[PDB]
Amino acid sequence: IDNSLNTNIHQYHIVGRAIPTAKDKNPNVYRMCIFAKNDTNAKSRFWYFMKKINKLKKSNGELLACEQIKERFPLRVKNYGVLLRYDSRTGTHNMYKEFRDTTKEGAIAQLYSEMAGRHRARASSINIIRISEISSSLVRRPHIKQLLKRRLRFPALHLPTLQKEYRKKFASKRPSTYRM
Amino acid sequence: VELTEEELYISKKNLLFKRFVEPGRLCLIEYGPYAGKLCFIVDIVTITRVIVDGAFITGVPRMVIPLKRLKLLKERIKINKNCKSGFLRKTVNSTKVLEEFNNSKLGKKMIIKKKRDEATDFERFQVYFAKRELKKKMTTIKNKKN
Amino acid sequence: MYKKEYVIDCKGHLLGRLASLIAKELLNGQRIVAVRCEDINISGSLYRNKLKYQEFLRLRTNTNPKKGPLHLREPSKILWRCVRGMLPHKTYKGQLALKKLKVCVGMPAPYDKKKKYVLPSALRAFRLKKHRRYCRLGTLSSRVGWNYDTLVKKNEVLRKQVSKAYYKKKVNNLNEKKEIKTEALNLINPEQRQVLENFGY
Amino acid sequence: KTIVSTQKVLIPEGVKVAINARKVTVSGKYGTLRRSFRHLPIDIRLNKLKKYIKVVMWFGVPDSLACIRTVCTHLKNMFTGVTKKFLYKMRLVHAHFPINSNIVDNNTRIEIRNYLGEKSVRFVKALPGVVIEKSPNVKDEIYVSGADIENVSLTAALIHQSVLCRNKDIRKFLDGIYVSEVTTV
Amino acid sequence: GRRPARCYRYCKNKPYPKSRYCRGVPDPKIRIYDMGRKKADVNEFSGVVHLVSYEYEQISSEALEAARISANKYMITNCGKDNFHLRVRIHPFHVLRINKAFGKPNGVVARVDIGQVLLSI
RNA sequence: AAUUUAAUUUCAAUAAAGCAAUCCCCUGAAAUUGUUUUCACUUUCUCCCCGCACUAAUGUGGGGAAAACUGGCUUUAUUUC
RNA sequence: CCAUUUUUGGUAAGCAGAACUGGCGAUGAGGGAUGCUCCUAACGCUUGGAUAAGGUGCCUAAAUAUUCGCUCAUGAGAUCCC
């Protein structure tokens, strides 16, 4: 239960094979990791890739395993690099982008948020090919490179946003945006 | 040889900005179900989000949240790269940060409000009674003073 | 009611939100006195607002402007007109709400004694990014030639200096009151004094 | 975009800087110069002990970084102006006609008569705090001098624009008064 | 005056070819096609460049000729006449009819759908 | 507001011990239808050297060293700290 | 007679003519500001519930909600049929 609120989307290891036949008595086993909102969606995404890659379809295959993946440490930061193929209005484009997070799932959430925000690209039009941990020295993006410096601080960059109780319509004196 | 000039530096150092978002600074949560608990900023994930960890006295668990949900407090104790719950608990006990917060004016305003809200009807009447007594004496002094 | 009158200092506020928030309350039934109405902000630039007002000025009833729309030139009336836009003024509830709103340029003396409040959700540097262009309504009105600003500025400075003496008097009186209060904590009963210290005052 | 952007702006030597209340102000040998930055997002700070001025912005974006350089260049000019005084030298060109230059209002307004033989009067008063002097060194030169780089430049430009005439060609019609040389005294 | 040709570019209406059903069909304006040195080999044609359509709207006979001749001149002026071959990959074939009873034959265009190549150098 | 026994790479401390020092939990980079082998990667409110106050900062840019406080693992007990 | 998809003539048409199905017509409640056909959904009379389409600054009922982007426009831009 916890008390925890925001942000959800999960990681699944799915394994499947072609249905056994007289013609082939030892089907090829195919495995993939898939980021999805649930197991049924994860199976469908696996099937879409199985259909695109192989000539296998749900009617001609069998599930060997499907199991949810949990990240090794929830609170230790890693730099995840993700390679995407996405579709524009005209056609197809490739991108490999870098995200600092404690979770691969969080990095995918940032990626979907970026693809939506910077290109107006819909979830349907994205294909994730590999998300993996990248060393600090190796990183291309300057926005991730800046985080990786020796020392970091800010004088508070964010406006207040008090609880509903204290968002009342009238104030007694003029306030300030933030303390110095 | 860096140690010879320092009297001047100490004498003339003043800067308006304070309460920097640097690891090990005490912060008051102002949004979400954890609001009104105080906590440390551990690591910084990215520009909007930070890794927060309450004191084990405040009891808000270690977690990622947006920095926007915090109001930073005066205190900071310098800390290592990662947390550790035990070492944080030992260091917080050593430096007495809650006591310092409580001694600070905002802590005083909060604890006075908390006590006042939870007070009994008899306690509330006693406060009313005491103020009524006080007003009588104050008016008596003001009349006498004339 | 909630309070006898809410008096609102329009300095630092953005037009739309202040009007919108007032309108829902106004419909609920509070009477609200807007003061310093010239010092409200529109979020467009000076040029952008001038352009919009010029277009508004262009609007007319071709066959007879005597029964046409009104190009209201007073900042209070501009605010009033905008609030009317956010009301169903053709209804009886709307007519009543429209009557309840009071708008005042600068600070009038029956309200200079009175307290003034502000709307924190309608403050410009709360709700508009710092580098964005903007314009004050009185300045905009002056820009499109409808200057009544210099008089208000003269009035405000005169009033503000007198007010300053009032504030120093109020502060002085509070210092003396605090001294008398602190004196008489010794004069009250110990146990009661201790209870009063324990929960604060 | 950037986390931190900074600038360290050269010592104003022998002169009195003040950074209080967003209207950055320097006084010196030739004047006191005032210039607001209240609309800018920067934490301009006076370093003071070793002199210099330090400009810093937190969480900058490329426009803001540019503003830091613009402001530092302005501060450098402000220091230069009060220390040594800005001179805009304007040379008067004419193929034929005499242009009669009467500086009136105690060296504050140049009155111009007879550009292209016009027999009509062009008046240009100076902006606040700036001198319009003549050259004894060479006949056609006009000195526009002052503490503020902007007021002298604007005044000189206004003098040029006021003289310059509308209509027909310009390529062989080179006549007029033009800024030649930007110096200090 | 001569119809806007804008009408012709859309691929709508049933495909109509030059045919025995025409009983009189107007000739395409394009008749020259290809230019350059026709006789060449794989060693010489180290570079082969293609112009691929992306819009997939029908292309007029006159437009094909006009585009091609412009290309030819640019090639001849830059690299000399005999050092290239410019091939017109596409051929007009869709006969279009208009009215002022079905229409009468007046236009000839190329049929254009996905991935087609117009020209090659 | 809770709650039961299962399931599924959960933990976190507690106080006594060890193990290695960019080394380990990890994660990099490398050499036909198998494994495996190599060196890369932590901290620091430690110290030194150069810049000698050069800072966004109670510091700081560069070069080196130092350690295991810090962290990681193996243990042994411990869970109402 | 109207809509999707397929479709013939005609430059095109809220044009002429179809195919399959569903509507409207003869039928409406809620939404689409508004509206014969779009969406949700078809109706005895009432009470209570929880939703749909659809929304939730004010007009106007619900969030000046949360969260990550992008965006300044001297005529910004704002939801199928439209």
From TrEMBL, chain B:
Pfam families: Ribosomal_L14e (PF01929)
Membrane spanning residue stretches: none
One BP annotation, GO: translation
Any single GO CC term annotated in Swiss-Prot or TrEMBL for this entry: cytosolic small ribosomal subunit
Entry keyword annotation includes Transmembrane helix: no
All copies of domain Large ribosomal subunit protein eL14, residue ranges: 61-133
CDD domains the UniProt entry points to: eL14
Gene3D superfamilies membership: 2.30.30.30
Keyword Ribosomal protein among record annotations: yes
GO molecular function ontology, one term from the record: structural constituent of ribosome
Alphabetical keyword list: Ribonucleoprotein, Ribosomal protein
Similarity field: Belongs to the eukaryotic ribosomal protein eL14 family.
PANTHER family on file: 60S RIBOSOMAL PROTEIN L14, LARGE RIBOSOMAL SUBUNIT PROTEIN EL14
Identification of the protein by name: 60S ribosomal protein L14, putative
Organism of origin: Plasmodium falciparum (isolate 3D7)
From TrEMBL, chain C:
Ribosomal protein found in the keyword field: yes
InterPro entries: Ribosomal_uL13, Ribosomal_uL13_euk/arc, Ribosomal_uL13_sf
Top-level taxon: Eukaryota
Keywords associated with the record: Ribonucleoprotein, Ribosomal protein
GO annotations of cellular component type: cytosolic large ribosomal subunit; ribosome
Record-linked Gene3D superfamilies: Ribosomal protein L13
GO molecular function terms listed in the Swiss-Prot or TrEMBL record: mRNA binding; structural constituent of ribosome
GO biological process assignments: negative regulation of translation; translation
One Pfam family here: Ribosomal_L13
Membership in a protein family: Belongs to the universal ribosomal protein uL13 family.
HAMAP family xref list: Ribosomal_uL13
UniProt cross-references to PANTHER family, sorted A to Z: LARGE RIBOSOMAL SUBUNIT PROTEIN UL13, RIBOSOMAL PROTEIN L13
Protein name: 60S ribosomal protein L13, putative
TrEMBL record, chain D:
Residue span(s) of domain Large ribosomal subunit protein uL6 alpha-beta: 11-84, 110-176
A GO term for molecular function: rRNA binding
Alphabetized UniProt keyword annotations: Ribonucleoprotein, Ribosomal protein
The UniProt record lists the keyword Zinc: no
UniProt superkingdom: Eukaryota
SUPFAM superfamilies: Ribosomal protein L6
Family matches, as Gene3D superfamilies: Ribosomal protein L6, alpha-beta domain (3.90.930.12)
Biological process (GO), any one: translation
UniProt feature coiled coil, ranges: none
GO cellular component, as recorded: cytosolic large ribosomal subunit; large ribosomal subunit
Family: Belongs to the universal ribosomal protein uL6 family.
Protein name (record): 60S ribosomal protein L6, putative
Organism of this sequence: Plasmodium falciparum (isolate 3D7)
UniProtKB/TrEMBL annotation, chain E:
An annotated GO cellular component: cytosolic large ribosomal subunit
UniProt GO MF annotations: structural constituent of ribosome
Binding, Mg(2+): 13
Keywords linked to the UniProt accession: Metal-binding, Ribonucleoprotein, Ribosomal protein
UniProt-listed GO biological process terms: translation
UniProt family annotation: Belongs to the universal ribosomal protein uL16 family.
The protein's name: 60S ribosomal protein L10, putative
Source organism of this protein record: Plasmodium falciparum (isolate 3D7)
